[PDB]
Design a protein around this motif. Sequence first.
Motif, short mmCIF file in Angstrom:
data_model
loop_
_atom_site.label_atom_id
_atom_site.label_comp_id
_atom_site.label_asym_id
_atom_site.label_seq_id
_atom_site.Cartn_x
_atom_site.Cartn_y
_atom_site.Cartn_z
N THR A 1 44.12 -6.74 89.16
CA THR A 1 45.26 -5.99 88.64
C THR A 1 46.55 -6.70 89.05
O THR A 1 46.57 -7.48 90.02
N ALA A 2 47.62 -6.43 88.30
CA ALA A 2 48.96 -6.96 88.58
C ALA A 2 49.54 -6.38 89.89
O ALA A 2 50.50 -6.91 90.45
N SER A 3 48.91 -5.28 90.38
CA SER A 3 49.25 -4.64 91.65
C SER A 3 48.91 -5.54 92.86
O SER A 3 49.74 -5.73 93.75
N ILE A 4 47.67 -6.10 92.88
CA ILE A 4 47.17 -6.87 94.05
C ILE A 4 47.64 -8.34 94.03
O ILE A 4 47.36 -9.06 94.98
N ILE A 5 48.33 -8.79 92.97
CA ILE A 5 48.90 -10.15 92.95
C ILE A 5 50.40 -10.06 93.26
O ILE A 5 51.09 -9.12 92.82
N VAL A 6 50.90 -11.01 94.07
CA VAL A 6 52.32 -11.10 94.43
C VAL A 6 52.85 -12.49 94.09
O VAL A 6 52.08 -13.41 93.78
N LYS A 7 54.17 -12.64 94.19
CA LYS A 7 54.84 -13.94 94.04
C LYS A 7 54.75 -14.70 95.35
O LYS A 7 54.73 -14.09 96.43
N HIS A 8 54.72 -16.03 95.25
CA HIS A 8 54.52 -16.94 96.41
C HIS A 8 55.66 -16.85 97.44
O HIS A 8 55.48 -17.27 98.59
N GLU A 9 56.82 -16.32 97.02
CA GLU A 9 57.99 -16.14 97.89
C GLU A 9 57.95 -14.78 98.63
O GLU A 9 58.52 -14.65 99.72
N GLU A 10 57.22 -13.79 98.07
CA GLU A 10 57.08 -12.45 98.68
C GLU A 10 55.89 -12.42 99.65
O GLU A 10 55.55 -11.37 100.19
N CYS A 11 55.28 -13.59 99.87
CA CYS A 11 54.26 -13.79 100.89
C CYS A 11 54.64 -15.02 101.73
O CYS A 11 54.99 -16.07 101.18
#
Length: 102
Positions: free
Chosen positions: A78-88
Amino acid sequence: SQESIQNKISQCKFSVCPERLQCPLEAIQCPITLEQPEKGIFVKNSDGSDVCTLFDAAAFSRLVGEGLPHPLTREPITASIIVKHEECIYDDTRGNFIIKGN
């Protein structure tokens, strides 16, 4: 639905550079392809311990396109469990990549 997830994969990804990131191959290895990827996304393994795992952008795009779930925790992608590389970021008290506070 694949399309919105693929929007997130295409934006959230980056061209991976182990020597620029100072990160060892294993720490940023794609667990799908069993190799340190050329490009990849951070997906929050929230089930495990909110650990951001680097999946190859096209390899994870494959799984979504086929209808195959998360290759680690088997959860519905889901688009919920994926983040942007800068927000991690690499967190020092967690000792590994996790999501930011805000």
